[PDB]
Ligand binder design. Sequence first.
Ligand code: NAD
Ligand code: NAD
Ligand code: NAD
Ligand code: NAD
Ligand code: IMP
Ligand code: IMP
Ligand code: IMP
Ligand code: IMP
Lengths: 357, 357, 357, 357
Amino acid sequence: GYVPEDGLTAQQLFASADGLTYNDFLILPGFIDFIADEVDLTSALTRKITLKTPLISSPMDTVTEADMAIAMALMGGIGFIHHNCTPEFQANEVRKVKKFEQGFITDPIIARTDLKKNRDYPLASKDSQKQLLCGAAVGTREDDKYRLDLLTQAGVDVIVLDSSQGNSVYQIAMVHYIKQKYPHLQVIGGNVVTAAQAKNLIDAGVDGLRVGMGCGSICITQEVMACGRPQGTAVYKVAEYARRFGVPIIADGGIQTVGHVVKALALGASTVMMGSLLAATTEAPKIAQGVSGSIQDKGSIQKFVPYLIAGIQHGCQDIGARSLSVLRSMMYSGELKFEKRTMSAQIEGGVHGLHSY
Amino acid sequence: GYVPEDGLTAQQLFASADGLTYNDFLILPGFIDFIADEVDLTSALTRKITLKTPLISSPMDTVTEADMAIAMALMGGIGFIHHNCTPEFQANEVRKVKKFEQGFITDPIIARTDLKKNRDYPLASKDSQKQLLCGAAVGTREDDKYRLDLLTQAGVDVIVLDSSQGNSVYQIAMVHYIKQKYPHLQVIGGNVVTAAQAKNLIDAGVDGLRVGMGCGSICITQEVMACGRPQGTAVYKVAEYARRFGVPIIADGGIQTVGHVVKALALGASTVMMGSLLAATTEAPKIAQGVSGSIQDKGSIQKFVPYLIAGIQHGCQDIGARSLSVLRSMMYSGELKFEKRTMSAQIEGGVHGLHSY
Amino acid sequence: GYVPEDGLTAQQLFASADGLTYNDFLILPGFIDFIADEVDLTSALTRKITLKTPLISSPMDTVTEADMAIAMALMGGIGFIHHNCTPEFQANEVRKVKKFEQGFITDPIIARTDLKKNRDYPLASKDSQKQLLCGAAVGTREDDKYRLDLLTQAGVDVIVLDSSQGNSVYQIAMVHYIKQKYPHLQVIGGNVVTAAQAKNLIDAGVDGLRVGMGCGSICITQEVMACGRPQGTAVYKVAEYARRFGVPIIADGGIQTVGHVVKALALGASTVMMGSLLAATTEAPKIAQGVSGSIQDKGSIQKFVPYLIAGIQHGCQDIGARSLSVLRSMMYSGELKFEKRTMSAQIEGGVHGLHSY
Amino acid sequence: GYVPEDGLTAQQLFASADGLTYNDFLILPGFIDFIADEVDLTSALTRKITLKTPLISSPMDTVTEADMAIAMALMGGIGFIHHNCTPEFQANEVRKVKKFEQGFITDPIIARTDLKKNRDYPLASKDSQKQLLCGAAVGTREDDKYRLDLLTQAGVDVIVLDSSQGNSVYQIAMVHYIKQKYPHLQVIGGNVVTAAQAKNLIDAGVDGLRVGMGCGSICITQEVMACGRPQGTAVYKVAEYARRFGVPIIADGGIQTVGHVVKALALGASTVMMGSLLAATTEAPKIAQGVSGSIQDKGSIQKFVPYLIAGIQHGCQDIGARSLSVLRSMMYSGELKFEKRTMSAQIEGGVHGLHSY
Ligand SMILES: NC(=O)c1ccc[n+]([C@@H]2O[C@H](COP(=O)([O-])OP(=O)(O)OC[C@H]3O[C@@H](n4cnc5c(N)ncnc54)[C@H](O)[C@@H]3O)[C@@H](O)[C@H]2O)c1
Ligand SMILES: NC(=O)c1ccc[n+]([C@@H]2O[C@H](COP(=O)([O-])OP(=O)(O)OC[C@H]3O[C@@H](n4cnc5c(N)ncnc54)[C@H](O)[C@@H]3O)[C@@H](O)[C@H]2O)c1
Ligand SMILES: NC(=O)c1ccc[n+]([C@@H]2O[C@H](COP(=O)([O-])OP(=O)(O)OC[C@H]3O[C@@H](n4cnc5c(N)ncnc54)[C@H](O)[C@@H]3O)[C@@H](O)[C@H]2O)c1
Ligand SMILES: NC(=O)c1ccc[n+]([C@@H]2O[C@H](COP(=O)([O-])OP(=O)(O)OC[C@H]3O[C@@H](n4cnc5c(N)ncnc54)[C@H](O)[C@@H]3O)[C@@H](O)[C@H]2O)c1
Ligand SMILES: O=c1[nH]cnc2c1ncn2[C@@H]1O[C@H](COP(=O)(O)O)[C@@H](O)[C@H]1O
Ligand SMILES: O=c1[nH]cnc2c1ncn2[C@@H]1O[C@H](COP(=O)(O)O)[C@@H](O)[C@H]1O
Ligand SMILES: O=c1[nH]cnc2c1ncn2[C@@H]1O[C@H](COP(=O)(O)O)[C@@H](O)[C@H]1O
Ligand SMILES: O=c1[nH]cnc2c1ncn2[C@@H]1O[C@H](COP(=O)(O)O)[C@@H](O)[C@H]1O
């Protein structure tokens, strides 16, 4: 009645200072004793918001403009309104997000079409009354403090502070300002990749952290600047540290299939920012450290996100985890076991042996 | 108030005999508490010359002929006049470099256009007289001793001794000859890659070393000869040794973006020789162990080098280093931390997931 | 419902090439669902004898002369008659062992006192009929071939070939001689310590091996000759090899408590030879690579061996092994777990903190 | 027909930088197919002397006066006459070694008692004549150059240069002097413990090396001076280097049993130098870095050295080595295998479990 324990526990992957990303490892399967589609996907975007689906849409002008934020909230995720735009435009934009369905309408009462929407979209993320949740990016420059006023009067729930570095005196100063002036506004950090720099943002009072820098599909920062972290290592090594204080970690960049979503959610992160996978769907709109564009068409979101939700929850089922909180327990108790891959051992992931596919 | 030490200190990368190059590692970010464009870039080229910008242009006929040496000096860097040419031509060439702007003109007084140039180009590298700095390559063969006379009477400041191996009895003999006959002329070694061979050139009296052999975009030496060193390991392991005596190390070859410049300067090198990145700009002109040519056009230098200077000093800011001397301190005190990458973990550096770019 | 695997599996101790011995490790406890004394203690002395208790008495003139061999057989173990004596004396000695109780007495019928002995000593080791089992040592010299005749006509069951080295051309030759001339006689090897030398004795046709050389309380061989093996490593590394062919391994020398008996029987050995622990009991009688004597009195055997049998079977109970065959299964399946000790971690074995004991 | 490789090869012990001595390891036994006492025990002492036994008596006032040097040469070994005495006494002393038995007596012819001695002592080490071999120590202070004259006119064959450090400019100078003035005199370098310092003595033209410093029973030096090696590591690491050029290695100090003689010769020394094991035999005679004396009576040397010769050659037989040249052939081919001892596996060398011994 004894059987050896195959594979590294989570801490034993990252005990070698080796720089793994999501491609470099696998999760060992475990005992299925539950039906394929009853696992619970609720995850925290900050200490005080739960989303009924862990998928976030990245604050960039190519992805979330006016309608991605609507759909992601109907689908129990969220969006962050971009900010390479005039502040009045962005504020009007989050306003036309918040008003899309309502409980007690204050500045047009109730309605019946809104209740039909409530019946049709059961996962929808709704704050209070019945309106949709929405976030936005705000910059770090001094003149962007004006934008907070328009956003606040426009009913935004949460904000990211956008900059490629989170551990700067300016971003900390901005977190202090927001947290002393607008105590109902939850704020989210700036692309951290190490526990020693997540500390300063946590002490400032940041209510959730997005993690990863210079790893991404449209993003060239590492290969032009030297700073970065292999983002599958980053998401574990910082969520190990942020879990002590309770702030959630949102995985950010390089997520280019469902497998990478499941790996990020097994390693510790609470939710995931999709960029270039959600870009070029139906409803998407002095040195240079970015890339121009060109993502191919990817259909309609309302038929796309359910595929992501079915894939992610099939992965959780076959790993053996009855919910995402159980998946993080199996991770931190050492019950999940992982295997490395040699470069060559990745090719038998369906890549070769066919004339076309 | 305790947080772990994420990543290898500098010495712990190269403690494994593993052959790293600039692609194989990343630098962990650190605290920004200074503005992005005030970090000091002054770097030594020999024990007795400082450049106001760490960028050098490689002595080859495809890069620096007559005008690259002018521009690099105006931009606070330098050039070395190539030497696959008749000695009189090369001497006339460094002469037409020195005369481009002047203090007291001896063999035409002063001028006003020269002072306008002084106002327009504030970084320019100059003698005590307002004339530009210039170096030259000189060969190792006996008959090339004649070239030293023309170069000396032509007002050259410094020389490289060209050959692909520096640790030869002939190059040492040539360093002794120059240092006993022309004591004002600073001399630079021949492409060393190990402390045990930098010793002989240092004892001869070499005033700076270029480091790296058979690693560089146009050079096939390793793949036809067996001798060489992974050049990111070479620059550290030899600058660890040369720092004791004070001679500068200049990193040489394979620098094909700004990230490689920042990595080379973080590892110990004082300055960097650009070849094929500066080749094919506006102002650029029995076995065979080199490659034919064909580099695409790269615009004008006066608008190109400032991009390099902005990128490099952005990298230094985000690492947290207030100057290049502070960057080398954070390196040798073990305060900089580095991560390895698997081959697979390099691909998420913006390479893939796009239809075109 | 997950809990880590504390301690090294058996193979993970001896995969470190560091020369462990019984003092230098511990066995981790395991689940008990059975009473202290039900565990089955039967073990094989050769491929074709089972003993109802695993203790053997060492063939030396200080231990087994005439009565130790009687008692050990009454107690379900065995003895080997010594051989530093005249062959006629030894043969008469094993004869006066075999005759001590009988079935059909051939050369005096049956008796009633013999059946009373059969009632009183239920563990007693007996061949066909009801006589006691007995072994003897025989030498390796040519003139000792005569002794085999007297021993054979005297009714010995099994023999050891005595020499301190087993892997010699002479011992192999002697095994062949005995196995072609007396096919009923089982023969036992000469103090082997490596699989590469157990091979030759196994191929000769040896039916069990005694393992260990130059480790033992009276034995100085290592400290005067250089040859040997740390005997707790020896017993595992050779029983890992002999188990393939089926021959049993008997652990030999350095057993100075019950803990060492249990450790030897966990590591693979089937039975154990006791020398200086059974020496100086009530019923015990050109270079020099041995020691003179002086073992203090140790009482009567009939009250001593049951203490050994209670201790050994208590150790098996607390490890959780329901029999000695289950204990070897838990060993080779990797279910037993072991811990090393630093030198400094052995003193807390009841040695210190007391004025007297 | 396959069986694993039990134990470390020779190079795999000392690849761990952990400072083993003779007590810290064992040699694995091997196949015997030869009789106990036929193994060829000849060894080189310098490039141009063979001894019919590897034991040497150490140059000290408590071991080597003429009575010892005689008895060792009769027993096929040697002695080095001590040198803390007046030069005339030492010269007279080696003269009374040489004259003890003769071929053609020049300054009294032949004799019959000398031929009786030749019949009685068959192993005796002798010149090209029949007179016994003798070495001596000579110092390295300049006034000791006088002693070389008396020793040379007295017929000494070989000399050690005695000083506790061999790698000094003075000992090198003395080797050059002797080798240019007295080319028939073989000279032995003093107490080296590293290949990097044996090089200078071999380049000076030393004809054999004494190896070990600060390890030895009367010698306190490591515990007073900081310099030294674990002498079982030193004898391997230096014989590995000296074997390239052909100079013999004599293992000096810490030899306190026959096992240590066999271990030194397995590790690659040609001969072994005995102090305290021969001190107090019947015919043995400003900082302090030595100990006073007090060694107990060791009996008569003609009945003692045959016990060393039987033990050393029994050890070789059981390792399986048919001669000492075969023992060093099995060493450097990696055919000998060694086991480390944990501290708690040395006690089992017959030390414990007895009331007296
Ligand atoms: N879409 C996203 O999620 C995302 C993520 C990262 C970066 N970005 C974008 O990347 C682009 C490149 O810029 P970046 O983000 O790398 O750096 P940035 O433009 O935020 O900042 C550039 C430099 O200026 C400094 N700076 C910023 N605010 C400052 C202030 N108030 N006072 C003084 N200095 C200040 C920063 O510390 C940094 O050193 C920007 O357009 C940004 O919006 C977007
Ligand atoms: N652009 C550069 O920085 C750069 C760097 C290396 C080589 N090169 C060029 O590549 C070509 C080959 O150069 P190389 O350095 O590989 O070899 P080289 O042409 O300098 O030397 C060729 C051979 O001659 C030997 N040699 C050189 N000088 C000698 C002397 N005075 N006396 C005796 N032997 C001598 C060398 O050891 C070598 O075996 C040359 O045209 C050189 O200018 C240019
Ligand atoms: N009590 C025991 O279980 C036990 C165990 C080991 C040794 N011993 C005793 O140790 C004592 C010391 O001797 P030992 O056993 O170490 O070695 P041994 O007496 O078996 O052999 C001594 C030498 O003779 C050689 N030899 C043995 N038989 C030979 C033959 N037929 N032909 C030629 N050469 C032969 C061996 O190779 C060895 O060199 C002996 O009295 C022996 O009985 C007893
Ligand atoms: N019995 C032995 O085989 C044995 C082995 C080693 C040392 N010793 C003894 O140890 C004792 C302590 O002395 P030691 O051997 O440690 O060192 P030492 O007395 O030989 O030398 C002491 C110092 O004087 C230096 N010295 C030697 N010759 C010199 C010269 N010509 N000019 C200048 N300096 C010179 C040495 O290099 C050293 O630094 C001596 O009596 C020596 O004989 C004996
Ligand atoms: O210009 C840029 N600088 C820094 N980060 C960027 C930039 N553009 C995109 N990103 C990152 O790219 C992520 C989108 O995921 P991706 O499509 O997998 O790369 C965003 O959430 C950002 O973290
Ligand atoms: O023919 C050659 N042999 C050896 N080294 C060369 C040769 N041509 C160029 N180099 C090296 O190539 C470096 C430039 O490399 P790059 O910047 O990658 O193009 C120069 O500074 C030289 O060190
Ligand atoms: O003289 C001897 N030489 C070699 N081995 C011996 C000698 N005497 C006893 N032994 C070994 O010592 C073992 C008993 O060790 P003990 O139980 O610790 O006393 C015996 O079974 C033999 O293997
Ligand atoms: O005063 C001393 N200084 C250094 N070495 C010494 C001194 N006296 C004796 N020796 C060494 O002490 C060792 C004693 O040899 P052992 O008695 O066989 O261990 C030999 O190697 C001697 O060369």
